Amino acid sequence: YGSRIEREQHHLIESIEKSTQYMAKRRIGALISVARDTGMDDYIETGIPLNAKISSQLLINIFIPNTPLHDGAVIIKGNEIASAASYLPLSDSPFLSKELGTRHRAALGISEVTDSITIVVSEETGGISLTKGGELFRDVSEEELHKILLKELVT
Numbered sequence: 001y002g003s004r005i006e007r008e009q010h011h012l013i014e015s016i017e018k019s020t021q022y023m024a025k026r027r028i029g030a031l032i033s034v035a036r037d038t039g040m041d042d043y044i045e046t047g048i049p050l051n052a053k054i055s056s057q058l059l060i061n062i063f064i065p066n067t068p069l070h071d072g073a074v075i076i077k078g079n080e081i082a083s084a085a086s087y088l089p090l091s092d093s094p095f096l097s098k099e100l101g102t103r104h105r106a107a108l109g110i111s112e113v114t115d116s117i118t119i120v121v122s123e124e125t126g127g128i129s130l131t132k133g134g135e136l137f138r139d140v141s142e143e144e145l146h147k148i149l150l151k152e153l154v155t
Contacts, residue, residue, distance in 0.1 A: 018056035020128050028063050029121055038116065047085050048083060050080075050083060092109075107120045130148055
């Protein structure tokens with residue numbers, strides 16, 4: 001019961017790590033929000049429902065540019081990719097650097113009103129960023145991404 005969950009959470013982390021590394025190298029923009037205690041059903045409803053098993057391959061295929069599923073956020077809920085091409089609210093923060101794009105503003109926006117963990121791949125730089133509780137972790141290393149995902153997603 002609780003042991004099966006740990007396997008699922010590590011698979012989720014690995015799937016995020018592999019897919020964002022693939023997308024970062026190719027400068028494919030991506031926006032992946034993982035729901036936690038705060039429901040995100042209201043934003044899942046804005047996307048295209050997938051209700052799919054989590055995998056690095058499916059995450060990569062979702063974000064391929066100019067495809068039906070890429071234009072918005074993936075939302076992960078429990079052990080599923082719930083929706084793709086979903087809306088996330090844009091932060092009104094003037095503290096967010098003007099160098100960062102809409103993906104970053106939307107990740108910051110959802111992090112201000114939920115406890116989700118949101119991962120961004122920049123299509124401009126390939127840098128990977130994370131938002132949590134209204135804060136931005138900009139351009140994190142693979143080691144840093146791993147430690148944060150471990151701390152925040154393995155419970």
